[PDB]
């Protein structure tokens with residue numbers, strides 16, 4: 108089943124066309140991190156190009172393919188070769204506070220595996236620029252709409268070179284998933300720890316256990332990936348773990364865990380979407396509010412019908 | 420701004436430490452506050468030029484009384500006469516004296532005179548590193564025990580707060596600044612130390628913090644680096660600040676020699692300003708405890724008499 112991740116990408120597109128994602132409990136990986144956790148670099152190392160500026164969710168659909176381009180759902184036909192204009196388009200579509208309405212970005216490339224990640228805004232604490240006083244709360248509350256849903260896997264990104272108790276990602280993950288059953292740990296910045304310290308206890312799954320494990324990473328992609336591989340092979344604390352460390356390994360294990368997760372939950376999703384259809388089918392058998400309520404219901408009907416056709 | 424003011428307060432600290440007291444007397448002093456991974460120990464050890472702290476390093480306050488001298492040695496108040504030349508035995512004695520009282524936290528100070536050519540005339544009250552999860556055989560409420568004990572010091576108006584934060588994490592995560600913001604929301608008695616400037620991400624810097632723009636403090640922020648042989652470490656730090664393009668213009672108000680100088684100056688000035696106010700408060704405390712003591716559990720009565728005598732001793736040290 109090379110088609111399972113693509114199948115769910117089509118489900119994501121169907122619901123993103125009507126500005127929906129979080130409420131439908133789709134099987135997906137949400138990427139969670141504090142603003143200084145190194146989340147952006149993890150995603151850019153998967154793509155192998157710099158493309159991030161965020162105030163909305165980015166449904167980043169990496170597709171294995173012979174040809175290399177990017178495609179936004181909201182401008183359906185336009186093929187993107189320049190990832191500098193991909194960055195500009197993310198900013199542009201965002202300006203179209205915080206919103207849970209997803210931006211869907213499909214990247215085709217032979218350097219990527221079949222993998223989809225829902226990147227959520229970095230957690231912050233102090234307002235900067237024209238952000239409101241409660242920006243911390245707005246971001247955290249929007250994150251919660253995604254990560255409270257049972258089919259959401261949490262990619263919890265934490266820096267190695269700070270106390271793990273300070274991790275914004277793990278504070279969120281502990282709240283919604285206290286048993287650590289759907290949280291995958293990413294440990295960044297292992298090259299920027301203090302002299303005579305290491306994160307071996309975390310990376311060996313001993314300090315704060317997660318069922319799905321911890322993967323270490325370090326941030327011209329070919330040179331960057333080469334330097335990462337060389338770091339893990341050279342470092343005496345991480346020599347023995349080296350073949351389950353780094354961004355290629357991380358990308359591989361997420362492909363495997365997402366594929367298996369979609370396999371487990373997609374039949375349950377069909378049932379839940381069917382119950383939603385039966386409920387909304389009863390509802391269908393005028394102010395600006397009342398018209399807007401009718402239009403939203405019809406858009407939802409269309410997305411559900413499109414989605415059920417994808418599942419088959 | 421007299422050179423005898425820090426020594427005067429050292430005598431006050433010794434008088435009250437002899438009866439197991441410090442925090443409740445509101446002495447003019449610098450409390451050193453930091454999260455367990457903020458680099459607080461390295462800041463103090465780079466002043467001294469020797470490794471001597473545990474490696475919540477400590478479970479009691481350390482009244483570190485630094486004295487400029489030709490030789491390197493230490494003297495504990497509790498162990499009168501005994502000179503410590505081995506700083507490895509200094510680390511052991513801190514731990515040993517801690518276990519003599521305490522596996523939780525106590526506010527009862529350990530007074531340590533450190534003689535070294537690497538130090539200026541300076542006293543610092545080092546408080547336990549803040550932690551969030553108990554490790555080893557530390558009790559379940561260790562986070563609360565540390566934070567509550569810290570508060571007994573830093574809520575007092577004459578306490579200057581030396582807030583140690585790492586540069587290579589979000590400044591909003593600083594345990595030190597969270598504490599300082601609570602007790603000193605206007606930032607009038609908080610001195611910022613920014614550590615680990617050499618371990619930040621590529622293409623980032625802490626210039627906005629170090630220029631006092633991001634989270635303003637009246638008394639300023641000082642950047643340091645531990646690239647550790649103290650002479651070689653200090654040389655490498657000086658070279659870092661001079662070389663780095665974000666910090667070139669600030670270089671002469673950065674680093675450990677500068678930090679040590681500015682703390683000497685700020686403490687001396689602070690002792691001068693508050694000493695008349697301290698006399699009045701200690702006099703009121705004496706008059707109050709004299710009414711309690713006027714008929715001169717037994718151990719509870721002993722503590723009241725000890726405090727009475729310490730106040731008289733302290734007022735005599737301050738004079739007129």
Ligand SMILES: [Cl-]
Nearest residue numbers: 141144274275
């Ligand atoms: Cl974080």
Ligand SMILES: [Cl-]
Nearest residue numbers: 454457593594
């Ligand atoms: Cl901290």
Ligand SMILES: [Zn+2]
Nearest residue numbers: 141230275589
């Ligand atoms: Zn944060």
Ligand SMILES: [Zn+2]
Nearest residue numbers: 408409410412
């Ligand atoms: Zn339709």
Ligand SMILES: [Zn+2]
Nearest residue numbers: 270454549594
């Ligand atoms: Zn902390």
Ligand SMILES: [Zn+2]
Nearest residue numbers: 707708710711
């Ligand atoms: Zn009374």
